[PDB]
Amino acid sequence: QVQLVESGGGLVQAGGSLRLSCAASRRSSRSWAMAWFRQAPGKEREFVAKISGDGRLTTYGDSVKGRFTISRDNAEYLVYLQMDSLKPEDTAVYYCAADDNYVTASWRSGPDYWGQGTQVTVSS
Fold it and tell me: What angle do CA 78, 80, 85 make, to 5 degrees?
């Protein structure tokens, strides 16, 4: 069992950057792959980025590759998403998720645990 809380969302101008974080409640979170997805209302939830328990593996969705960076701090039990060069199509609710299986962490049906989300709105 893992519970997840996202912070850091809000309003940003296109071209700018924002940093999100996902806080896990327990030390054991380190054993889980963690992933960010996003969903705009009425659209399908979309994979954004994932990272292995030990931080050594990361994978990105094609539309954010080279603009976003996922990382994690297992001492504070946080996973971070650094978003650069934001575009209006990045506007969404951003969700962090945990999956004991790194490979299925990028698949909609993979993760076992989800946060409630944090809103990111890119104006332009």
Answer: 170
**Domain of 58: which CATH number?**
2.60.40.10
For the chain, the domain total comes to 1
Q: In whole angstroms, give the CA distance from residue 76 to residue 116.
A: 20
The DSSP secondary structure of the chain, one letter per residue, reads ---EEEE--EEEETT--EEEEEEESSGGGGGSEEEEEEE-TTS--EEEEEE-TTS--EEE-TTTTTTEEEEEETTTTEEEEEE-S--GGG-EEEEEEEES-TGGGGSTT--SEE---EEEEEE-
Instruction: Find the domain containing 63 and state its range.
Output: 1-124
Integer CA distances (angstroms), 52 to 28, 101, 124, in order: 13, 9, 34
